[PDB]
Design a protein around this ligand. Structure first.
Ligand SMILES: *[C@@H]1O[C@H](CO)[C@@H](O[C@@H]2O[C@H](CO)[C@@H](O[C@@H]3O[C@H](CO[C@H]4O[C@H](CO)[C@@H](O)[C@H](O)[C@@H]4O)[C@@H](O)[C@H](O[C@H]4O[C@H](CO)[C@@H](O)[C@H](O)[C@@H]4O)[C@@H]3O)[C@H](O)[C@H]2NC(C)=O)[C@H](O)[C@H]1NC(C)=O
Ligand SMILES: *[C@@H]1O[C@H](CO)[C@@H](O[C@@H]2O[C@H](CO)[C@@H](O[C@@H]3O[C@H](CO[C@H]4O[C@H](CO)[C@@H](O)[C@H](O)[C@@H]4O)[C@@H](O)[C@H](O[C@H]4O[C@H](CO)[C@@H](O)[C@H](O)[C@@H]4O)[C@@H]3O)[C@H](O)[C@H]2NC(C)=O)[C@H](O)[C@H]1NC(C)=O
Ligand SMILES: *[C@@H]1O[C@H](CO)[C@@H](O[C@@H]2O[C@H](CO)[C@@H](O[C@@H]3O[C@H](CO)[C@@H](O)[C@H](O)[C@@H]3O)[C@H](O)[C@H]2NC(C)=O)[C@H](O)[C@H]1NC(C)=O
Ligand SMILES: *[C@@H]1O[C@H](CO)[C@@H](O[C@@H]2O[C@H](CO)[C@@H](O[C@@H]3O[C@H](CO)[C@@H](O)[C@H](O)[C@@H]3O)[C@H](O)[C@H]2NC(C)=O)[C@H](O)[C@H]1NC(C)=O
Lengths: 393, 390
């Protein structure tokens, strides 16, 4: 009881993003140890404790905050769109978990449209399923369907003419006059409701048969590309260009912070289909600036792509605990991983102390300085916390 | 009574033309005696006649008659030409002329259906195939009743046609659902005006809960290039419930600082769209659109680049220097950007890049015509001067 007394530490934290249908509801959980055992308190962004809301928000045993299923008219912003957090506290101090973003989605409007595409014979074609920005978080392309129905799904066989890219576009090798008679519909899936539906629009291709030579041209919006992909996932890099004769596509990666570039090596992991680079099992080193060089006899063109491979954020403090004599300095170092890293910030007993560096330093330790210390690592998506304790010697 | 050649009329940097229309480039130069005009390639070699394809007119213009698509020849129809003018006193070459013939090709405009949250502005775009993209643009938009929407200086209305050709729509309500919009494009080579068979539609949605401002990944970064004196627009494509506020800033170069954009007669803002007329080179820079509502935020980066036509001049236009005394040439030029400066003597590159060229001692060999050339990845310009002997 008195032996091995510790400040609190989180065993289990909720994930950064909690997104759920009003029909599904949600449950988040928080666990922490310590001696004495800490009390768990669900808090709001302003630091105040959240209470029960009938039929909407419920605090239960085992430190679980529950959001039951609810009618559309029952939607409440103060409940269903909010950032929560877990507060663990005992006599030695307080720690706050990473931000928990709770968003309930009441089932609503969405639909996909497919832009028609004029393509020169022999060139590759790309059909895109365009999804509204406000549903794009929960809605992505599952597959494609031709006029006969035949279902086209993503795969590792790149040898076929029809290929669904990791990003969801339908890629078609070496178009020909027959392809003009085919029409395609994209099937999208809502990850919250598990619902799937076909686009009302049918993607078409108009195949042009030029005699006179046409030089490579990239539409201005395709000239620069910015792609974000999760670590270990699969992804593709488009180079959108048409020419007669059909052009060649060469992919290079710039050496960071220089104008020099090296050709991208094709292997089991990295494949190239026409102008498209297809990469499975993303790695941290893939991140960087890429260049696609397009050439035919009459002219040439280029596409610049900035790739960012995101990795989950994690944080740790060295030491997890230390005992410092009065008057002597105390230093805390926040070790973190994940990509990208925007900020690093420090906290003491649930209060931001206004220090932005991985190293927190207390010049002269006093009574008031003892307690729990945290560092938070954040980016536009994820947050991660680490905790440590300062004791007086 | 005696003069070296100088160009009165030079061809433009770019000549684009349809195989149906053909094209004609003109070069005129003044000198005593009258200089002969010779057409050459980029490599400096003389161009010959190709029957039905490349010809010289009665007044000495290089002619590209209309031709069958099967008669397309790259050496003729994709080429960089130049005009060489000379007399007994020397030679001068005009700026590069990029000649590109374009065989008429089938094309059409499609319009993506736009889902819009009630109260938000909407932007409809006329999507054009890449191979006609340089030669085809939107001159207007037409609703279901045939009412023509033209770009205007009145920004207070419901509809606004932006310089880039998009149809901007203020504060979309569900009452706008029944309407349709078609773009009327213009082919500058063939002069053909045509109406899109596709009809742009707005689908209006009313969200149950609040919505954070959201920008599609491809709209997060934007890049705009515009010529001097020309009007343009900077889009911030974002939607939120309730409707958001749009704040435009401009970064101070080489810093994280930013200054808010100053709206005036020249610079006006419609919803989240920044619209500017009479572009100036100073407008060039990196901009930031910040979007806000009660429930969240979002941003859009835009790199703007304004270019100016290249022009060149040499001071003095002509000079006579005694044997042994130095001669000085200074190249005055304008336009943006300037990538390279190169000089020339009597049609031959002398390998000097500076705005100033000075001979320390004039010899009888130094007698002749001198030129300086300003260049970038698109445009080129020249200036000529004569040197005599005293
Ligand atoms: C979260 O919020 C969403 C959005 O408001 C709710 O979803 C709606 O729920 C209602 C009620 O269940 C759905 O109503 C539909 O009613 C059909 C007929 O029901 C009537 O049957 C007879 C007709 O006279 C009468 O007894 C009486 O009038 C009944 O009301 C059902 O057949 C529907 O079921 C099926 O069809 C729909 C598509 O129409 C499918 O999506 C369903 O999965 C099911 O296969 C349906 O129940 C309404 O359609 C829902 N809208 C949407 C967009 O899904 C959720 O209920 C709410 N979650 C909660 C409350 O937990
Ligand atoms: C209207 O909408 C705009 C756009 O969304 C909002 O502007 C954003 O505001 C947030 C918060 O104010 C900004 O995020 C913050 O940026 C600070 C500066 O970061 C710099 O330094 C780091 C290195 O540490 C670099 O990686 C980075 O590139 C910058 O150079 C951070 O220091 C902040 O972090 C600290 O504060 C937050 C709380 O805000 C803590 O959670 C963190 O742990 C840390 O202690 C913070 O990340 C964001 O950059 C702004 N966006 C833009 C585009 O400027 C407006 O806030 C909004 N208006 C209103 C009224 O809400
Ligand atoms: C295939 O296409 C690529 C891209 O269009 C061509 O590469 C580009 O070549 C141009 C020259 O034709 C380069 O511009 C030049 O740059 C120098 C400065 O380095 C400048 O002094 C010149 O006046 C000219 O503007 C351009 O940088 C280059 N870009 C890339 C990404 O390589 C390539 O030449 C084409 N292949 C063939 C065989 O032509
Ligand atoms: C320049 O090249 C273009 C493209 O090859 C030529 O356009 C083509 O012209 C032929 C007629 O010579 C068109 O065929 C005919 O069209 C009419 C309708 O206009 C139709 O009734 C006939 O049965 C026949 O199909 C062809 O469609 C057209 N193609 C395109 C893409 O426009 C043009 O003639 C060339 N110009 C010159 C001066 O050679």
């Amino acid at each position: 009881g008195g032996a091995d007394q510790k400040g609190p530490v989180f065993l289990k934290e909720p994930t950064n993003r909690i997104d759920f249908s009003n029909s599904t509801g949600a449950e988040i959980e928080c666990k922490a140890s310590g001696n004495p055992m800490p009390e768990i308190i669900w808090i709001r962004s302003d630091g105040t404790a959240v209470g029960d809301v009938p039929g909407l928000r419920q605090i239960s045993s085992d430190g679980k905050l529950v959001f039951p299923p609810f009618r559309a008219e029952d939607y409440r912003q103060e409940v269903h769109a909010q950032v929560y957090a877990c507060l663990a506290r005992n006599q030695f101090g307080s720690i706050i978990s990473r931000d928990v973003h709770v968003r309930a989605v009441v089932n609503q409007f969405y639909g996909a449209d497919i832009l028609m595409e004029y393509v020169i014979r022999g060139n590759a074609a790309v059909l895109k399923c365009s999804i509204p920005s406000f549903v794009a978080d929960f809605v992505r392309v599952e597959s494609w369907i031709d006029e006969e129905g035949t279902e086209l799904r993503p795969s590792e066989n790149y040898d076929g003419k029809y290929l669904v890219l990791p990003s969801g576009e339908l890629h078609i090798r070496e178009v020909g006059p027959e392809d003009g008679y085919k029409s395609y519909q994209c099937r999208t899936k809502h990850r919250l409701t598990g619902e799937t539906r076909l686009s009302a629009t049918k993607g078409r291709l108009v195949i042009t048969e030029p005699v006179g030579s046409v030089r490579p041209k990239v539409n201005p919006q395709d000239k620069h590309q910015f792609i974000d992909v999760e670590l270990a996932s699969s992804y593709s890099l488009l180079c959108m260009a048409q020419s007669y004769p059909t052009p060649s596509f060469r992919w290079y990666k710039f050496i960071e912070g220089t104008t020099r570039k090296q050709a991208v090596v094709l292997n089991d992991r990295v494949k190239q289909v026409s102008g498209t680079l297809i990469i499975k099992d993303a790695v941290v080193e893939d991140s960087g600036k890429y260049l696609c060089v397009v050439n035919n006899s009459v002219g040439g063109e280029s596409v610049e792509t900035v790739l960012t491979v995101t990795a989950p954020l994690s944080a740790k403090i060295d030491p997890p605990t230390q005992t410092v004599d009065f008057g002597r300095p105390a230093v805390f170092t926040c070790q973190y991983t994940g990509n990208p890293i925007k900020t690093v910030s420090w906290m003491k007993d649930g209060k931001a102390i206004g220090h932005s560096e991985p190293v927190l330093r207390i010049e002269s330790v006093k009574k008031e300085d003892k307690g729990m210390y945290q560092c938070f690592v954040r980016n536009d998506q994820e947050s991660a916390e680490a905790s440590a304790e300062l004791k007086l010697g």
